[PDB]
Design a protein around this ligand. Structure first.
Ligand SMILES: Cc1noc(C)c1-c1cnc2c(-c3ccc(C(=O)O)cc3)cn([C@@H](C)c3ccccn3)c2c1
Length: 127
């Protein structure tokens, strides 16, 4: 089986705005997670062909990753902060669905998720 194309990241038919919270999600939240020791498996879509995971996209129907989230933020794909937060949560949940509890990759995701949840407790004031 072929990989699916990556999620859409730039859509001129979606409206565009910059907000305090979206800026913070890119410049603080994503930036912080991106540099984490365990970030790298989450920095791009799962390449199921390269990684020999034929069942991955048979179960994960809403793939998401931080490379995609970063591009979405950079291209003003999100209007509301919650849309971005939801994508991070989808990324973590996908990992917890496909992989057995306690697996290495799950422990990595859990560490990132803990940091993520801490950082979004510090969002700046909304317009
Ligand atoms: C499965 C799965 N479910 O959710 C995710 C997310 C994954 C996932 C995604 N990417 C990887 C990569 C990976 C990423 C980038 C590169 C690169 O050359 O740029 C090379 C390999 C390797 N692995 C395996 C071995 C791995 C890595 C660390 C710990 C345990 N297993 C991955 C697992």
């Amino acid at each position: 089986g072929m990989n699916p194309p990556p999620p859409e990241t730039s859509n001129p038919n979606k409206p565009k705005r910059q907000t305090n919270q979206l800026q913070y999600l890119l410049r603080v939240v994503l930036k912080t997670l991106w540099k984490h020791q365990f970030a790298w498996p989450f920095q791009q879509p799962v390449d199921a062909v390269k990684l020999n995971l034929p069942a991955y996209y048979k179960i994960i129907k809403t793939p998401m990753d931080m490379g995609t989230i970063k591009k979405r933020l950079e291209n003003n794909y999100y209007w509301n902060a919650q849309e971005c937060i939801q994508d991070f949560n989808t990324m973590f949940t996908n990992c917890y669905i496909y992989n057995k509890p306690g697996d290495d990759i799950v422990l990595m995701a859990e560490a990132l998720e803990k940091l993520f949840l801490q950082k979004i407790n510090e969002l700046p004031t909304e317009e």
